[PDB]
């Protein structure tokens, strides 16, 4: 079966790592920091990995239900998986699909759907949203165990033992003890634990070449800032990867990325096995070219290939 | 080009009116309001049409200006997504993405100035409201928060949910807000859809939507969704009758489960006489089967 892309442009596709569209693609040749993010991780014949899984609702969500108030105001909440069956702690996956896979205080809403149902108003179910923080950086995050803890400005309206959803939003800022770093996993089992089973961490192995990330800047809930989170993949790369399942003929796909106005090349890329990119750039930062633009997938090539310079 | 559907199943999919996962197959064949909703629109031959667009994440979004703060509630200008200025000359009904349907939307408004300083606050808009004017370049929310909101900065409206759906509250999801205010006509619109053949009715994607406070169990019905809306316009296939036979799939036993018609106009129907879910697996799919003849008779769900 024939490898393929989709042909969504830059400005039809979203981030899988955080639900925001795509805004630039970027480099950082410079980084020192070792890459691996566990979402947007697919090769390229479709095999899932990390906490990846096919939502765009499902990113850096949570569903559970909350236990009780925790002596901001915390709340402990057990997670399920994101279709609501008991999370296996034995399955080969670093956490729930979907767990967040940086530290920082990711911001967005707590809701909740009573389970019991109230004759006096129509056999209704009561409901309730609160803005939340979940810090991934801290002790209490073991979503491999089961459980994670949130924070709220509301002091009361949260109810134990209801069906509960967070919808991610953004980070609650980047202030320096926040500690928002988009390349530091979190400990999925806790304090002073080894992650397991997590997909490969990517790196250029070809002089010259750098990767080339999906950027997408990601909303505060308050403080200084301009932050970003950069992925390997656009989500919609995952589910059209994940179910066209074709072989790979090679270690590498090469890609134009091009500019469907003009049928021009602007660059060329690698697209490596593991699903991420390389290019030939000397420099950080965006690359400046309209977003009307896509990657066309030309030929295998092996990793050997020279790209032209960007 | 052969016609084809993704193969992701129940659970691998989205709703495209709102950023939710699709729960469940559903019917309501005594429904009396015309259904006409404006996301999650597109023809089987791939045109997008209403307020359709892409982006799961521009289902239900704004982006635009907060200007004035009017007796708490902020009037915003919006822009298109893209962050270009709307054109209301355009023929379309709305900036894509725009809600399609009466209630009290809930979510964040989030800023960023033009190290830039931030906020975000919980917030509400009000799709019956008169001052909902999005083809006009403009939308209202309100907040709990009194003050703290910036005029003139880049602010941006992500949806999480319905704020109530009391008797206050204007809850109709088949009820299209004017996109032009009070004393208007909305305009270029998707066209409606029903069945047309005796013992059908239509079958929905089924997502339930948050609230942020009191009683119910609020949902959403789209036609097709997300993935199928970005799918289609892809690939942009030849429509080769009025309706695409399909059949929905248990890929664990291969077993056909029941069989609907997807039609040109992008929605299915089904031969059905009783409303509610579809209890089904949701790791099951539709599978593309044949296009079919105007007397094509389903076999009853």
Redo the contacts between chains.
């Keep these: 079966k024939p490898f393929t892309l ?3 442009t830059l ?4 981030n899988s790592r955080f ?3 795509i805004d630039v693609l970027y480099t950082n040749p410079n980084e020192s920091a070792i890459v691996q993010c566990q979402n947007g991780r697919c090769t390229l014949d479709g095999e899932l990995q990390g906490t990846t899984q ?5 990113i850096c969500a949570f569903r559970g239900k909350v236990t009780q108030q925790v002596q901001g105001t915390h709340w402990n909440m057990t997670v399920t998986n ?2 609501g069956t008991p999370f296996d702690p034995t399955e080969d996956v670093p956490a729930p699909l979907g767990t967040p896979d940086f530290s920082g205080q990711i ?1 967005g ?1 707590i ?1 909740q ?1 009573n389970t019991n149902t ?1 004759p006096g ?2 056999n ?6 609160h ?1 939340a923080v979940i810090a991934t950086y801290s002790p209490k995050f073991t979503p491999k165990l089961g459980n994670i803890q949130f924070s709220t400005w509301e002091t009361q309206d949260v109810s134990s033992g209801q069906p509960t ?1 967070f ?1 991610p ?2 980070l609650a ?1 980047v202030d320096a003890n926040s500690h928002f770093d988009q390349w530091t996993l979190p400990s999925y089992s806790g304090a002073l634990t080894l992650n397991m089973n997590l997909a490969p961490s990517v790196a250029p192995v070809f002089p010259g070449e750098c990767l080339l990330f999906f950027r997408s ?1 990601i ?8 932050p970003a989170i950069d992925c390997l993949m656009p ?2 790369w995952v ?1 059209h990867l994940y ?1 066209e399942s074709a072989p790979s003929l090679s270690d590498v796909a090469l890609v134009r990325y091009v500019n469907p106005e003009t049928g021009r090349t602007l660059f060329e890329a690698k697209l490596h096995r593991n699903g991420f990119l390389t290019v030939a750039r000397n420099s950080a930062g965006p690359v400046v070219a309209p ?1 009307n633009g896509y990657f066309r997938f030309d030929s295998w090539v092996n990793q050997f290939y020279t790209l032209a310079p960007m």
Excluded at 11 to 14: D, H, I, K, P, Q
């Design positions: 989709p042909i969504l400005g039809e596709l979203t639900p925001l569209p096919l939502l765009p609702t499902g994101l279709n911001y809403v809701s759907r109230v108003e129509g209704l179910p009561a409901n309730r949203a803005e959803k919808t939003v953004g800022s800047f909303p505060l809930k308050g403080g200084y800032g301009n989500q919609e589910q179910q977003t």
